[PDB]
Amino acid sequence: ATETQGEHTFPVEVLISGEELRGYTAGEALSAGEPVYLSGDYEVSASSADGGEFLGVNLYDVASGEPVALAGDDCEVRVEVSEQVTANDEILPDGLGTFETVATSAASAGVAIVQEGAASGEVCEAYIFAVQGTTA
Amino acid sequence: HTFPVEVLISGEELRGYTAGEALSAGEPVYLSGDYEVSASSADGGEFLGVNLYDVASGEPVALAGDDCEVRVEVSEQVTANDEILPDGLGTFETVATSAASAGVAIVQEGAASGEVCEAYIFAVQGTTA
Amino acid sequence: ATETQGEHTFPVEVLISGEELRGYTAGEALSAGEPVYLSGDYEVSASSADGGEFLGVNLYDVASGEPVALAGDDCEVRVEVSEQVTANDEILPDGLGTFETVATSAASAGVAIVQEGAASGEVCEAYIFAVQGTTA
Amino acid sequence: ATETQGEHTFPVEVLISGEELRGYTAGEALSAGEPVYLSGDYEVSASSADGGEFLGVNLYDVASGEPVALAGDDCEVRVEVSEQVTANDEILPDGLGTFETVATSAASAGVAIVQEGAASGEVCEAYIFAVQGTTA
Amino acid sequence: EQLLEVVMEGRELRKVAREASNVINANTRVGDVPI
Amino acid sequence: PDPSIDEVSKSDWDALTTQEQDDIISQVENLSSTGWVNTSRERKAEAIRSAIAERDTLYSGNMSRLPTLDGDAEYFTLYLSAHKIQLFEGGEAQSESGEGGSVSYSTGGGGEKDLQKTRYGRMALEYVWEDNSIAALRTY
Amino acid sequence: PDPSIDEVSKSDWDALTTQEQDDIISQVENLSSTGWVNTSRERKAEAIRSAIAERDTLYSGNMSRLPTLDGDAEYFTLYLSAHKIQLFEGGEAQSESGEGGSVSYSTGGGGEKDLQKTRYGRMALEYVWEDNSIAALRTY
Amino acid sequence: ASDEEFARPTGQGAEIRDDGETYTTVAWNATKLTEGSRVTDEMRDQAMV
Amino acid sequence: IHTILYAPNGQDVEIKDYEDPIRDITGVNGRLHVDCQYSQGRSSATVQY
Amino acid sequence: NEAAINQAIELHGFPQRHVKVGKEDGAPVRDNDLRRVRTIFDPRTTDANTAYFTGQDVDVETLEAHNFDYSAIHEMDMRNLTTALGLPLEAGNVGADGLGSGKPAELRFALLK
Amino acid sequence: NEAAINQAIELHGFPQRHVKVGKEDGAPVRDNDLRRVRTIFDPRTTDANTAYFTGQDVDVETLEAHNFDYSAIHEMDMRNLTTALGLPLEAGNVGADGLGSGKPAELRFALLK
Amino acid sequence: MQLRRSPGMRPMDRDWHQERARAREQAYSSDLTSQFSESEIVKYELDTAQIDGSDNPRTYIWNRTIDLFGMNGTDVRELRNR
Amino acid sequence: MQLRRSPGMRPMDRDWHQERARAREQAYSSDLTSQFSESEIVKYELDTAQIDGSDNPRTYIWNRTIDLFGMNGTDVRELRNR
Numbered sequence A, C, D: 001a002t003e004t005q006g007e008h009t010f011p012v013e014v015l016i017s018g019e020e021l022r023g024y025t026a027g028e029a030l031s032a033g034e035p036v037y038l039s040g041d042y043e044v045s046a047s048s049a050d051g052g053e054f055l056g057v058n059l060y061d062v063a064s065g066e067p068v069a070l071a072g073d074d075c076e077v078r079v080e081v082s083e084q085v086t087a088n089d090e091i092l093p094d095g096l097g098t099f100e101t102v103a104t105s106a107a108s109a110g111v112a113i114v115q116e117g118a119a120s121g122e123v124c125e126a127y128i129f130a131v132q133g134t135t136a
Numbered sequence B: 001h002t003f004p005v006e007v008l009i010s011g012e013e014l015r016g017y018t019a020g021e022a023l024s025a026g027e028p029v030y031l032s033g034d035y036e037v038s039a040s041s042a043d044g045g046e047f048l049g050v051n052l053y054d055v056a057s058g059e060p061v062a063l064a065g066d067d068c069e070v071r072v073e074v075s076e077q078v079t080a081n082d083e084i085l086p087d088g089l090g091t092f093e094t095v096a097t098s099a100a101s102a103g104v105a106i107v108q109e110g111a112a113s114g115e116v117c118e119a120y121i122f123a124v125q126g127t128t129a
Numbered sequence E: 001e002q003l004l005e006v007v008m009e010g011r012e013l014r015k016v017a018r019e020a021s022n023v024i025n026a027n028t029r030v031g032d033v034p035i
Numbered sequence F, G: 001p002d003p004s005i006d007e008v009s010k011s012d013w014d015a016l017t018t019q020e021q022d023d024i025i026s027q028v029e030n031l032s033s034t035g036w037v038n039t040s041r042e043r044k045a046e047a048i049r050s051a052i053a054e055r056d057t058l059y060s061g062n063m064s065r066l067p068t069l070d071g072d073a074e075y076f077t078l079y080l081s082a083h084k085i086q087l088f089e090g091g092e093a094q095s096e097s098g099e100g101g102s103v104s105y106s107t108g109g110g111g112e113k114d115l116q117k118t119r120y121g122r123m124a125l126e127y128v129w130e131d132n133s134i135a136a137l138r139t140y
Numbered sequence H: 001a002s003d004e005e006f007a008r009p010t011g012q013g014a015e016i017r018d019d020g021e022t023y024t025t026v027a028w029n030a031t032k033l034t035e036g037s038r039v040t041d042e043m044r045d046q047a048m049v
Numbered sequence I: 001i002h003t004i005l006y007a008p009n010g011q012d013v014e015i016k017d018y019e020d021p022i023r024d025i026t027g028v029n030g031r032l033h034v035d036c037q038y039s040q041g042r043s044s045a046t047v048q049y
Numbered sequence J, K: 001n002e003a004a005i006n007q008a009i010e011l012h013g014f015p016q017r018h019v020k021v022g023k024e025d026g027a028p029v030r031d032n033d034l035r036r037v038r039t040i041f042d043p044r045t046t047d048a049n050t051a052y053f054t055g056q057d058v059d060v061e062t063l064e065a066h067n068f069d070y071s072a073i074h075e076m077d078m079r080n081l082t083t084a085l086g087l088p089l090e091a092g093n094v095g096a097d098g099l100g101s102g103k104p105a106e107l108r109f110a111l112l113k
Numbered sequence L, M: 001m002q003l004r005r006s007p008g009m010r011p012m013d014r015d016w017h018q019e020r021a022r023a024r025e026q027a028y029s030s031d032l033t034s035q036f037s038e039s040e041i042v043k044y045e046l047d048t049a050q051i052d053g054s055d056n057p058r059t060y061i062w063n064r065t066i067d068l069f070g071m072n073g074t075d076v077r078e079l080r081n082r
């Protein structure tokens, strides 16, 4: 996720507010702003689509096996979306390193609420409010 | 008119928004534009927190979010462990009464219809379709 | 919940991380690491099975009518499980002082997610992300 | 009653001239420049629409039961008229907190005489020269 | 009132890596040694 | 009853069907062995409507942060209703005498104030701290 | 009733239609099981008019900024009307006796003041702080 | 304070008339403006600036 | 035209640096309360295109 | 003891206003009623020469400053500490009966020297 | 005796607040009801000029600081100990009456020498 | 002539400022009629004061029924991140 | 995080030591329910203390109804042959 200032492009700063920042081992290479889920004991990997796989968003780029910092629920974040989102949309991982709306997905409930809208392929601002694991 | 007041019991989770309409202390609100909050409707697509203090339309507003403990008016009788959500009338009501299946706050002090209960806000609700 | 070190049994430190500590009255005698729910006005008792009854875990042993400290949601905790659990499993109060998986319970949603897998009777590490009350 | 000066609204100074001020008790809430009459022992209330109810004009805003200052007769006052008035017109309480002319009222004699004419809803200057009470 | 102001220690592990290896006090968290 | 007497405010009672009201009336009539069968429906309805209104206005709010209505709100409203019906009947009978048969009851000098004056009122009074003033408040 | 008894002042009562007055009269008659049927309409009207007048003059205004009529204004005015009608019939019957039997009621040692002197008065009295004097003011 | 006005023509011995200074107010309501940022200790250490 | 600054702690504008020892982060937070009001809006004119 | 004294001074060294509302055995007063009373009798916004007008059923009581001899506790603490450290009590800004003059002074200053 | 005094000062040297709740012979108050009264009158969050507004049925009583002459107990202890060790009482930072002047001073200083 | 209570003079009175400042600090709502005397609302023109309870310190103070951590009495606008 | 009452911290608490010593000197038997509050039994883990009445001085002190010889108040574990 990147911001343009005329000539220049800058890295988007993933975190806006919140202190619920937690440490894990990366199960694979990951990028700032990617949604992730538990793939092993204290190990996180990129979320697939349609729920049951979300612990937080990765805060900075990591290679496989590196320690990684993650923003959980109670955090307010800048994240890239797969589609147009509007204020009050619930969103969750699209399986493509980015978020989509609950309304578009096969899931019934999301993990973050959109606070500032965005176009497709663009950065929204969202508050993370839930985690999703394996329920069977 | 009536007055639920001194709405914050405990909690650090206050966030700033723009009021999309005139709002009152303890009123449940939801997102209605980019960082704009308005009063919640009745059946569970629409909650972010409760407004701390009375505000006019367009003013900056302090919103008590989840992880936060609040005094709120309930439109019906509630008891400890009841889940509640916005009622569409500035009040809360139980999940049991509503068309919804999940709440946004857990009742910690029981209350009669039209009285103030004490609740812990634990979730938010948006547009799922 | 106990480490063994030679002759010695050491109680495990229940609360791994989190600032979400709150005080309640004991509705009955309770022991460290039990899941509890609101049994009355600011009063907590041990959770039964199959959901609708969870506020946090008790942090210390109490008689009935004493003040109780809870770890609520937003906390990470060391808790005993009654069955094998694995990372990403959602877990739920078991009615027995333990937790069990959502998959084993009659419920459809959990209250904590397992970060560190454990066998039956062992100490798991888990993150508490939700509370459950009477929805009818 | 009001002057406008740019953004600002200024209250008019009600009493122009006169030394005969007297203190009464408010029988109801009253506002500066309202005509009032005796309604109990040393108690004044807002004048009704025709003759027989005028002791003076209230000089400042009051709640019920507060002490009131009156400008009585022998005073010159800035007062709002509900209709267009001219110099030499006798005027009378209107029942609406304003004055109106004797000519417009059902009465036959006034309580003040206009010295400086005004439009409807506008501040005239008038000399208060008589009181009126219950004659039957 | 009189009381033992003592705590008996747990097991203590042997610590050797600072002596038993070449130690680099790095200026940066990430870096390179050329070979 | 389907809507219980504690679920309804004064405006709700007016909005109920006659059957929903009759269910609540029938529950109130359980509180006397006589059922007050010689008092007409309109009077039992007036008593219940009044008890609802009086609960919501005189026996509502908090003391410290405790609810003023501490007991079960259902049974409080029913006892408050029975109190009113019994006063519409003229009060507690202290004694009744008929065709040679006679009875006297231990009502006694139970008190001067409204709820003290009948058995139903004395029951209702225990639900609401016995009308005691345990409220406290602070500056910060 | 369509205009409620709490929505009318003394001058409004005089302006109501005979039916609007009769609706309020009918509501007041629900507060006694006998309905005071042997007392004429003019007397029931006078009692209601007087209760409205007395509410607006003796049981109005504020007391430490609290409303002095703390309970429901409807039921207060009705109980104040019922109190007056009962006093027009000579007061509380403490005991009644005849061919049909005898009864004695637990009225007891009721206090000196008028509202204490009937059951309706004692009910009305709870709506108005039990006539307590909790007013307070300060100098600014 | 109200605007500056004019004195009026007057007779000898005639009562002078009151044109006293009258006042109004402009209200203020100071809004809380805020800004924030965070840096890790590692980043604080390693940066050239 | 008046810029009105409110300082609950007397200092005109408050910039704080603080450490989080639980996360090893330094935060830099700025706050101010400000309003602006004319005393006489008549004392000014906009030039309009 | 210093911490205990400092805490007790805040709690007990100053009088505190206790407004009691309602008649004894009268009508009960609820929390939202006391919210009005708290606005009227607010100490934080009271002038020295404020006057009050009430009905009979309002009582402005005082929690008096409950006297305890904190000075004697300080003198005792300072005696214990100065003697423990071998200093004369005078070093602690605390005086003593009889000890300030004559041979009693000559001894304690000899011990110090 | 030093330990006994120190503990007695902790318990009795400072006043303590006793809030009594409910009317005498009225409705009983349970532990969960007192928990809310404790929140109001908590000394941990009270300050010097805090004020309280209540119904008639809350009584703010005080355990007074219960007087005892700990100074006289210390003087006795020090007299015992100093005389037992043969030192003059003055060495203990404790004064005396009549002994500080004239031939009474001359004797005790002669005995020490 | 202008009295101390007269409408054009209220802004000169020290008490009009002091009492409006008190009213803002004491308030728990914009609903003045709930809380203030008819005298206060008239005498201090409290309709014109921006009263809403946002200036009352107790709007921001924690007062939980059981406190094991000494959190009560803390004012949230005195925290690090405010 | 660990609180004073937390199970791993009890042996650090001075009061847990002092109060277990008190409990041993109070008792006449191992039956804790007969002698201690249920709060004390949990808070001080009195199940794990060797409470049996053998440490209570009153177990060993003589206290006959009538005493002509000043025997009462002697402690048997302070005699010559003990």
Ligand SMILES: [K+]
Binding pocket: A049, A104, A105, A106
């Ligand atoms: K899809």
Ligand SMILES: [K+]
Binding pocket: B042, B097, B098, B099
């Ligand atoms: K509904």
Ligand SMILES: [K+]
Binding pocket: C049, C104, C105, C106
């Ligand atoms: K099961």
Ligand SMILES: [K+]
Binding pocket: D049, D104, D105, D106
């Ligand atoms: K006319």
Ligand SMILES: [Mg+2]
Binding pocket: A017, A018, A019, A074, A075, A076, B013, B015
């Ligand atoms: Mg936050």
Ligand SMILES: [Mg+2]
Binding pocket: A073, A074, B066, B067, C073, C074
């Ligand atoms: Mg949270």
Ligand SMILES: [Mg+2]
Binding pocket: A019, A020, A021, C017, C018, C019, C074
């Ligand atoms: Mg954390």
Ligand SMILES: [Mg+2]
Binding pocket: D017, D018, D019, D074, H015
């Ligand atoms: Mg003149």
Ligand SMILES: [Mg+2]
Binding pocket: E030, E031, E032
């Ligand atoms: Mg490299």
Ligand SMILES: [Mg+2]
Binding pocket: F070, F071
């Ligand atoms: Mg109770």
Ligand SMILES: [Mg+2]
Binding pocket: F057, F058, G070, G071
């Ligand atoms: Mg009330």
Ligand SMILES: [Mg+2]
Binding pocket: H005, H006, H007, H008, H019
């Ligand atoms: Mg002029």
Ligand SMILES: [Mg+2]
Binding pocket: H005, H019
């Ligand atoms: Mg002018």
Ligand SMILES: [Mg+2]
Binding pocket: F113, F131, G126, G130, J026, J027, J028
């Ligand atoms: Mg009463």
Ligand SMILES: [Mg+2]
Binding pocket: F126, F130, K026, K027, K028
């Ligand atoms: Mg009882």
